[PDB]
Amino acid sequence: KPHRFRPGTVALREIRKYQKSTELLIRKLPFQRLVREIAQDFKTDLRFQSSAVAALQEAAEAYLVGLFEDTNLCAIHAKRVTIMPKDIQLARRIRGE
Template identity: 70%
Template sequence: MPPKTGRGRKAMAGTPRKSTAGARAAASSSKAPVTAAPEASASPSSPRVRKTTASQPRGGKRPAAAKKIAKPSNVQPGDPTPRGQKRRYKPGTVALKEIRKYQRSFDLLIQKLPFARLVREVAMDLLPSEVGSELRWQSHAIQAIQEAAEAFLVHLFEDTNLCAIHAKRVTIMQKDIQLARRIRGAWGGLG
């Protein structure tokens, strides 16, 4: 019996086979080694045997690249590890991410100390000099002014964005802010 190689019956058709029955009978009659006579070559009427060769792979994993020889580097232990390239997002993706982030949050966006300094400076300019220098502020008072200022700015930018969209643009400009303030009036609030 030939060894099993995984090939089908058709692939084995043209290969010569040893006759097991005749070989056993001859072996029992004489002690001489017996070899089977080669069969006649395939005649034109017999089915042709097609040699199958391994084809090129069509998918799957890429062949493993040759291993690179490690070259000596001048990196010493304890050196900071080099960072890879920062990820590049498509234009507009980061802006939409930031919009969602700031719409979810409740905290104030302007820093507290610079805003407090600005409030104190404006108060000193508006009040008489003898009162302005002695003026003290509670932290809650400055926080309330900051809340109102940020709400005013957010509402102004919403109207400004509508003005830019009305002009068939997506970029807001100074003329959009001026138009929004003119439409709202001198003391246009959050109405």
């Protein structure tokens, strides 16, 4: 008789655990490779300080967390629970982005 959580409870546990914590939630090396790949277009052979990459990662994480909060609000507004692409697009459209 394996004790299995009903679908949904572990999602709420993850929500509580992550909101209770402060550490970053994106792998640092892939993010650094992504930043270098993006900056390759604007200027050739650039060099990034570690603190600059950390600041970029923190800004990106904060922006995504805010966007997901607004997307969750939009989804709840439509009486759904499952956020969808039509919810992120609306949250961006209202902000003007």
